[PDB]
Amino acid sequence: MFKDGSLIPYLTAGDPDKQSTLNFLLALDEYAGAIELGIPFSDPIADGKTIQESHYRALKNGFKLREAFWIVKEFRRHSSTPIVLMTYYNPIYRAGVRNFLAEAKASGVDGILVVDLPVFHAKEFTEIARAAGIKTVFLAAPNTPDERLKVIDDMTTGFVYLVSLYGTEEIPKTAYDLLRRAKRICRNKVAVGFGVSKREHVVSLLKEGANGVVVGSALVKIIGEKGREATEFLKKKVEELLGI
């Protein structure tokens, strides 16, 4: 879904508020090959501590599911950068999958990543996304075996998202292994979310085959520190990571 060598910013919708998220996206768009917008959830047990806390902030501040579409829609008035909505299944499942994706497509979403999509629903789900014109993005962690990476790749229409809960401040060997195994199996492009925080991480991961590199923790951490005034620091952080 994105150019090779892309830096993909990740932000939690509504952290600290929807208008700020929009401000952050617009300020970072010029450096993004694509964007992951996360829907805050009460139990983000698959995320790192930094991102989990941003989910809590957004929910405390009063975030509401559809405020995510407002953010995407408004962003779309100024940009066409690919957008991937990241979310836990619960919210989607409870609101009605079919209506959610149609609405997602309507507001401008290009792809969707369901962090904990139940295998039992995978097939039907991908079929529903395709009919809605929404590309699928599947997640794989270091404990994901080759056999599954292949099954994941064949279902993927957007891009395979490789992650590492290990955190760092260096990218763990287990994370490099996942990337190395995935590039040997996936036909789809792969994006990596290994908790980058230093310019050499970006240079290193792209060099090892990552089609794209997500930057979430580093940006969210700044948002938890600066709140609504995080904007400028977000831009500096991204420039540091791009060597510019």
From Swiss-Prot:
Entry keyword set: Amino-acid biosynthesis, Aromatic amino acid biosynthesis, Lyase, Tryptophan biosynthesis
EC number: 4.2.1.20
Signal peptide: none
GO molecular function, one term: tryptophan synthase activity
Similarity-based family: Belongs to the TrpA family.
Subunit and partners: Tetramer of two alpha and two beta chains.
Protein name in UniProt: Tryptophan synthase alpha chain
Taxonomy of the source species: Archaea, Methanobacteriati, Methanobacteriota, Thermococci, Thermococcales
Gene: trpA
